[PDB]
Amino acid sequence: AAPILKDVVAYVEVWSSNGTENYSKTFTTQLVDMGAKVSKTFNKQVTHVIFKDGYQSTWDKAQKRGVKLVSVLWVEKCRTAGAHIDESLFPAANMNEHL
Ligand SMILES: [Cl-]
């Protein structure tokens, strides 16, 4: 138990694929438990976007702003490893990205 993600300012958009369930609150809780700040809005302070089936506008903004854009598996792996894991190993997915 340690503030391993103290330098992270996260914005979280984690949804079911069919867009009916928003699971962002539980990933928010996991991140805060590791010392991160989680922003309610995707402002200029945000360093990390945790993305699953979120808004296309969020995907695009994360890419264009050059923030770390990671899957939920990143959050789990930091937790289970007790370490700030390399974000490049956990690229987020967007099934519509090349369409
Ligand atoms: Cl799902």
UniProtKB/Swiss-Prot annotation:
Pathology linked to this chain's protein: Microcephaly 1, primary, autosomal recessive: A disease defined as a head circumference more than 3 standard deviations below the age-related mean. Brain weight is markedly reduced and the cerebral cortex is disproportionately small. Despite this marked reduction in size, the gyral pattern is relatively well preserved, with no major abnormality in cortical architecture. Affected individuals have mild to severe intellectual disability. Primary microcephaly is further defined by the absence of other syndromic features or significant neurological deficits due to degenerative brain disorder.
Domain notes: BRCT domain 1 is required to prevent abnormal chromosome condensation. It binds directly to the SWI-SNF chromatin remodeling complex.
Note: MCPH1 deficient cells exhibit a delay in post-mitotic chromosome decondensation.
Subcellular localization, as worded in the UniProt entry: Cytoplasm, Cytoskeleton, Microtubule organizing center, Centrosome
BRCT domain boundaries: 1-92
Tissue-specific expression: Expressed in fetal brain, liver and kidney.
Chain's role: Implicated in chromosome condensation and DNA damage induced cellular responses. May play a role in neurogenesis and regulation of the size of the cerebral cortex.
Disulfide topology: none
Domain of life, source organism: Eukaryota
Annotated phenotype, changing residue 26 to R: In MCPH1; mild phenotype
Protein name, entry field: Microcephalin
Species of provenance: Homo sapiens (Human)
Subunit structure: Interacts with CDC27 and maybe other components of the APC/C complex. Interacts with histone variant H2AX under DNA damage conditions.
Parent sequence residues shown: 2 to 100 of 835
